[PDB]
Design a protein around this ligand. Structure first.
Ligand SMILES: NC(=O)C1=CN([C@@H]2O[C@H](COP(=O)(O)OP(=O)(O)OC[C@H]3O[C@@H](n4cnc5c(N)ncnc54)[C@H](OP(=O)(O)O)[C@@H]3O)[C@@H](O)[C@H]2O)C=CC1
Ligand SMILES: NC(=O)C1=CN([C@@H]2O[C@H](COP(=O)(O)OP(=O)(O)OC[C@H]3O[C@@H](n4cnc5c(N)ncnc54)[C@H](OP(=O)(O)O)[C@@H]3O)[C@@H](O)[C@H]2O)C=CC1
Lengths: 1216, 88, 88
């Protein structure tokens, strides 16, 4: 009863277990159980572990134990010496069981490395430790340093070389890692059963040898033909790994956003919306001549109902349901605040300030309520630190809602705009008022106090209702009792005049269609002589001038970077990085980037008043585009997943195991390139739901369990279907997977013809059930007429098919059903059955029924699908020469035992699996096909009872099937059946489904710098879309074991992968690269991932560094952009990978940000002409600035959305 | 190892096993998909030794063969084997 | 081994008995109801008394002594009878 406590604390000797993290959670190594069992045995025999050669057998792990972050878990070990059995328990729960015993006579010959199947190519390349553990991480294993024991491994992973740190657990776990490395099955697989393990410490010591370094190693060899792993004095055979659930919780949540131009001044922003239009229509109507839930219409209804005209001021001002401060809740009053315009203004303020910290104070927060809306908008900024505070007219105001202020870091204040601000607030960084609902004490006094309270160069943001607009007049008529609120409404020209009187400058103005406006003004700053340094010059020789200018740390003159000769200049990304470096405060950018030649190009000469206006503004960003001055701003991306109308969709669960996530997604059949002899596309009208589909949808069955090569991402729901052939013929088919969709592609050998009398609905239930019944009985069981049969679950589809087949032969059938109604249904459907033919299937009582009613002889043929105890009971029902047809999976998957004594009865035991036909042995499938055809034409085959669900209600169908009350089969009417027999117009009706990315097999795709880190992942992701034509570019070619491994794997699958080594920086190189792709086929898309980086503060930077950094990205994007428009009418994607460094800025990477921004400009230009174009801004890629690295799975998942998303530039990152 | 190697790791379709104990278990691991295991031995059957049922996940038929079953109960099943032997 | 509800009886390190034993969570008397006799034969004029039954057993080779002589009677076919009880 040995007891082991596993403590992972730093002091505990088992601290190394912390490094065995799989799927993000620490797990006790499968070999740890072997280690503790070995130690327990050695203690039992009184020997030492090093002196005890041991043998394990039939090791089976019944669950996984999770080592907690804190605390300890006790593992108990019990040994049965007589039976040589052992049992490990956790809180009295079985964990590991098997057999362990001493090895009497160790045989050194056992550990000699077996014959190598390969011809010993002696290839030079091999995976180093870093590459091995990078691949393992990509697969999902996160071993730490203590479990990083593989020094190297061959490309195919058959042989390697492991470290020996005098730890058995690590060594054996490393052996398991080597075994898993060679497998092609993507996913997280863990050991479940091991046939036998032999450990011999003496030969282990003999085998170990020391490299030139003192580290000890031990060669490892993995033989998949023999299913054995040998390394030093250890020998593992018959390992069996099973797919882990792989579901990780609290996954990363990237902040998806778009990056679009935004004019400084804009009016009529909300004109797009309609609810606001209807609200305004209602409001104006109720005022004519002097009925909804919205507060303002309610107030107008109060003003009218109480009295049609001449309403008392008291009643209109004071009345229930209106005196409540619900005015901001009215959609019209909050139209601008909900719009992105507020975010644009806030970002404009945040950009123009030296300190990374913000000090913003709200006034009259009792009514403005901006405190509940401003801080949330600023969460996306990674490093921004905010010091917000809400101030009201009197402390009694905003007395409630304190918890809202508590959740945020908002402080309290008691400043009245009438008087000057208290010293505590001081020179605030930003002032937010919300004059729309809050009542100003007075315009002049409020502005005079606020401007004083605002630091020099600070920003003042105001929201109100401009006088003279219909809404302004409407509000003026009401609230006549609140003269302060009346003072808060003035004409836009009145505001203009008021700003000048207070020596304040307007920089931004967002106006709604109904008069609501969002002013943005900043306190002027002492004018100083600026510097105008042009940057449009190529060769970056201007960098020296800029570096010199910033050298004068004493000098404080503002520095203006001027770019007025290249719409593709990346100065916007340049300044962002510089502002995070010393002397970056003085930086200020002016850019002219008209996307249309016809657009006017203004002059920015110092004399030109146009330049003077922006100089007065003094904004960091001054981007001019088509007669407008604005800048690029980040906005959150719409959450809805884009959908499109299509005729090729399939049903899939977006989130594994969640029936609520079932939805229609676009199918890869949209291209249907492989339409040829040996396959054909068939329209789908009805699709059936089998038990396996429910198991997949519920998540209880892994996709890998389905035989066949399946993409890591793909939908495998549905096996049957009935619908019209490509020629209009009515047919019913059978597919390994993807049956539940609007179309299916299958070989003609799996199609039957629906008889005239049948209907497409009926035929949808025949194929799988009758095919499996015919196979299991006739082909395998070889039933003969007159024999006795036991058919468990007669009410099921397979049960009904088997019953129908058996009766036709004239056989006595015993069947088991779960409830009385099913028994009655069967009795009605099969009159031959009598009362002595039904037994209960939820209980083992059927065993006595069969034995009694057969005189104790038993049955000849058993078609079992039940559980372990039911199965064992069923075996006892077999007669001499019996035959056990088994179609279940639980016992077989679990490898439960079976007493071989039953075979003394001369019985036969069959493992029936229809899935084998799809993979191979299609020659023998035609036998079952002919059987089913004969049964159809001879009347033996009858369609089952079908419950129909429409396509939209597929989730309801899954729910109903899961409940388990159905009798017969459940089908999904994808498309109704036309009365006509043969219809030429077999085109599926257009449907709206989620949009995915798929690539034709007859197009070529280029990935500049594809051999890099992220490049290989992108290439593999594309291959999962069936690219079948790929060109990867790299200056140095293939020079790493990982790259060669991946490339050879792709070539093996049949993809034509080409490595060009043709630079895109030179125009001729780009043209040659494009021409090379055309040889394989027309160019589908080009991806630019080339990058060469040289960091350093601008002082260290030199023109050579800028040229190097911009050579692959800026110049290459220009070239590839020129060569694609000229030579690629077919191409549909022009993707480019920018970085968060630009847009968000990053210290010491000015050249990198410049290159990325200039690159984004090209993509913006291309879209304007309708050509494909997309620049993606990534924060940090994990597996290969205040933001965490982003896992590759999440990166590719996001990339899939962006391809679908319309915006020209998009970004994604993970907050700290 | 000999069979799993010279067969390319696939195995053998038919196994006519008469060995016992561990050697029986070793034989089962030589089976290939759609294989058939003919068990003409009798020891492990008499001892009711366990058989892991996971082997059946590969379509596999496990036959318990007893020639003497023909003698005790007369049946036409024997005339088939008689004809086979005569033809041979 | 309560975890796997398996017991084992050993003698000087030699395995003797092995199996699974566990508490019966939900006993139900219906299990102990007597199944019907396949052959009715309600008459049963004659039956084997204790002396006769054990006389036959010893002829076959079983020499149980008085403490193990519990069968008070049994039908000729030997499918039913009455057994003694002595808190053993
Ligand atoms: N090896 C092969 O060739 C193939 C194997 N099969 C096997 O056929 C077997 C039977 O399939 P089929 O009869 O069509 O399946 P169904 O789900 O239609 O079976 C319904 C019957 O089984 C029970 N049952 C099965 N699934 C459920 C459920 N989700 N909820 C409630 N009751 C359920 C029902 O109640 P009750 O509990 O009373 O029985 C009913 O009697 C499966 O185990 C499958 O693995 C099928 C085709 C290929
Ligand atoms: N943290 C991150 O990783 C982030 C990623 N990104 C973007 O992700 C994209 C993916 O690449 P990434 O993994 O970052 O970079 P890597 O350097 O890892 O991979 C890109 C590869 O491009 C190749 N390359 C460089 N110059 C050229 C050239 N002139 N012609 C052809 N190939 C060239 C290099 O291989 P070789 O040396 O053989 O030429 C290099 O390995 C990049 O465009 C980057 O901007 C941006 C933001 C975040």
């Amino acid at each position: 009863a040995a007891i082991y406590n596993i403590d992972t604390s730093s002091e505990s000797p088992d601290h190394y277990l912390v490094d065995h993290t799989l799927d993000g959670r620490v797990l006790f190594p499968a070999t740890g159980y072997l280690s503790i069992v070995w130690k327990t045995l050695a203690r039992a025999l009184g020997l030492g572990v090093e002196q005890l050669p041991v043998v394990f057998e039939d090791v089976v792990l019944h669950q996984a134990t999770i080592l907690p972050k804190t605390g300890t878990v006790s593992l108990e070990v019990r040994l049965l010496e007589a039976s040589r059995a052992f049992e490990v328990s956790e809180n009295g729960n079985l964990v590991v069981s098997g057999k362990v015993y001493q090895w009497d006579d160790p045989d050194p010959r056992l550990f000699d490395h077996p014959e190598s199947p390969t011809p010993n190519p002696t290839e030079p390349l091999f995976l180093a430790q870093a590459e091995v553990y990078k691949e393992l991480r990509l697969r999902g294993y996160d071993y730490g340093p203590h479990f990083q024991g593989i020094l190297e491994a061959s490309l195919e992973g058959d042989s390697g070389r492991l470290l020996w740190k005098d730890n058995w657990v690590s060594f054996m776990d490393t052996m398991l890692q080597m075994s898993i490395l060679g497998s092609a099955k993507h996913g997280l697989y863990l050991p479940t059963r091991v046939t036998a393990i032999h450990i011999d410490p003496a030969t282990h010591r003999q085998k170990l040898y020391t490299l030139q370094d003192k580290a000890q190693v031990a060669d490892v060899v993995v033989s998949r033909w023999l299913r054995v792993t040998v390394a030093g004095g250890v020998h593992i055979s018959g390992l069996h790994t099973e797919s882990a659930p792989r579901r990780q919780q609290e996954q990363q949540v990237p902040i998806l956003e778009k990056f679009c131009f935004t004019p400084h001044t804009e009016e009529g922003c909300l004109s797009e919306r309609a609810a606001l239009q209807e609200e305004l229509q209602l409001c104006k109507g109720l005022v004519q001549a002097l009925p909804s839930q919205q507060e303002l219409p309610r107030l107008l209804s109060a003003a009218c109902r109480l009295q049609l005209n001449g309403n008392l001021q008291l009643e209109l001002a004071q009345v229930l349901a209106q005196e409540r401060p619900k005015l901001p809740e009215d959609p019209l009053l909050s139209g601008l605040l909900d719009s992105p315009a507020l975010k644009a203004c806030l970002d404009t303020a945040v950009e123009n300030m030296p300190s990374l910290k913000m000090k913003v104070v709200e006034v009259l927060a009792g009514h403005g309520h901006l405190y509940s809306r401003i801080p949330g908008l600023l969460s996306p900024h990674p490093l921004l630190q905010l010091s917000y505070t809400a101030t009201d007219r009197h402390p009694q105001a905003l007395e409630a809602a304190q918890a809202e202020l508590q959740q945020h870091d908002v402080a309290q204040g008691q400043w009245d705009p009438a008087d000057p601000a208290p010293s505590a607030l001081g020179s605030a960084d930003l002032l937010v008022c919300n004059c729309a609902v809050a009542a100003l004490g007075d315009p002049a006094s409020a502005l005079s106090n606020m401007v004083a309270a605002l630091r020099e160069g600070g920003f003042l943001l105001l929201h109100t209702l401009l006088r003279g607009h219909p809404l302004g007049d409407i509000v003026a008529f009401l609230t006549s009792t609140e003269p302060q609120y009346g003072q808060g409404i003035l004409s836009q020209d009145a505001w203009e005049s008021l700003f000048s009187r207070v020596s304040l400058r307007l920089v931004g103005l967002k106006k709604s269609f109904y008069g609501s406006t969002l002013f943005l003004c900043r306190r002027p700053t002492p004018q100083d002589s600026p510097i105008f340094l042009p940057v449009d010059d190529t060769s970056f020789r201007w960098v020296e001038s800029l570096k010199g200018i910033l050298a004068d740390e004493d000098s404080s003159r503002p520095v203006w970077l001027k770019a007025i000769n290249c719409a593709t200049s990346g100065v916007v990304g340049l300044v962002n990085c510089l502002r995070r470096e010393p002397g970056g405060n003085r930086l200020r950018c002016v850019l002219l980037s008209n996307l249309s030649s016809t657009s006017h190009v203004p002059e920015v000469d110092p004399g030109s008043a146009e330049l003077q206006k922006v100089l007065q503004g003094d904004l960091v960003m001054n981007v001019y585009r088509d007669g407008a001055w604005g800048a690029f701003r980040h906005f959150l991306l719409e959450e809805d997943k884009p959908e499109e109308p299509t005729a090729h969709a399939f049903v899939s669960t977006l989130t594994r195991g969640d029936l609520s996530s079932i939805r229609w997604v676009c199918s890869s059949l949209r291209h249907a390139q492989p339409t040829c002899p040996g396959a054909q596309l068939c329209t789908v009208y009805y699709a059936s739901l089998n038990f396996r589909d429910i198991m997949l949808a519920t998540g209880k069955l892994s996709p890998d369990a389905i035989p066949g090569k399946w993409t890591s991402q793909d939908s495998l729901l549905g096996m049957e279907f009935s619908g019209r052939d490509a020629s209009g013929k009515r047919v019913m088919g059978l597919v390994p997977a993807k049956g539940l969709a609007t179309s299916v592609l299958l070989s003609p050998d799996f199609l039957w013809d629906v008889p005239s009398n049948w209907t497409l609905e009926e035929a949808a239930s025949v194929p799988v059930v009758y095919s499996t019944a015919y196979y299991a009985l006739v082909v395998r069981g070889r039933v003969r007429p007159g024999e006795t049969l036991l058919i468990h679950s007669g009410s099921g589809g397979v049960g009904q098919a088997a019953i129908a087949i058996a009766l036709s032969l004239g056989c006595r059938v015993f069947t088991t059903v779960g409830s009385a109604e099913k028994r009655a249904y069967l009795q009605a459907r099969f009159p031959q059955l009598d009362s002595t033919s039904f037994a209960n299937s939820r209980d083992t009582s059927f065993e006595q029924h069969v034995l009694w009613h057969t005189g104790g002889k038993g049955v000849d043929l058993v078609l079992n699908s039940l559980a372990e105890e039911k199965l064992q009971a069923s075996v006892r029902c077999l007669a001499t020469h019996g035959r056990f047809l088994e179609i279940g999976k639980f016992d077989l998957s679990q490898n439960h035992p079976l007493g071989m004594a039953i075979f003394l009865k001369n019985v036969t035991f069959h493992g029936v699996l229809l899935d084998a036909f799809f993979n191979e042995s299609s020659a023998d499938w035609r036998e079952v096909w002919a059987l089913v055809q004969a049964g159809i034409r001879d009347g033996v085959v009858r369609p089952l009872k079908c419950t129909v669900f429409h396509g939209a209600q597929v989730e309801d169908a899954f729910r109903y099937m899961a409940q388990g009350k159905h009798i017969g089969k459940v089908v999904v009417q994808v498309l109704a059946e036309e009365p006509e027999a043969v219809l030429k117009g077999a085109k599926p009706k257009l449907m709206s489904a989620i949009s995915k990315t798929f690539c034709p097999a007859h197009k070529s795709y280029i990935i500049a710098g594809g051999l890099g880190g992220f490049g290989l992942e992108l290439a593999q992701w594309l291959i999962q879309r069936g690219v079948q034509k790929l060109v990867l570019t790299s200056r140095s070619g293939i020079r790493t074991g990982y790259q060669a491994k991946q490339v050879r794997r792709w070539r093996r699958q049949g993809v034509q992968v080409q490595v060009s080594t043709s630079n895109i920086s030179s125009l001729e190189g780009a043209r040659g690269l494009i021409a090379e792709a055309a040889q394989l086929g027309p160019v589908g898309g080009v991806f630019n991932l080339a990058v060469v980086l040289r960091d350093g503060l601008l002082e260290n930077q030199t023109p050579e560094f800028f040229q190097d950094v911009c050579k692959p990205k800026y110049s290459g994007t220009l070239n590839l952009d020129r060569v694609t428009r000229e030579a690629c009418p077919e191409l549909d994607y022009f993707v480019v990978f920018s970085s968060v460094s630009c847009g968000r800025g990053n210290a010491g990477q000015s050249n990198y940000g410049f290159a990325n921004s200039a690159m984004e400009r090209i993509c913006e230009k291309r879209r304007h002409e309708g050509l494909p174009g997309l620049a993606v801004q990534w924060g940090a890629i994990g597996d290969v600035s205040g933001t965490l690295p982003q896992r590759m799975a999440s990166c590719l998942e996001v990339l899939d959305l962006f391809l679908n998303q319309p915006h020209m530039v998009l970004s994604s990152f993970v907050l700290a």
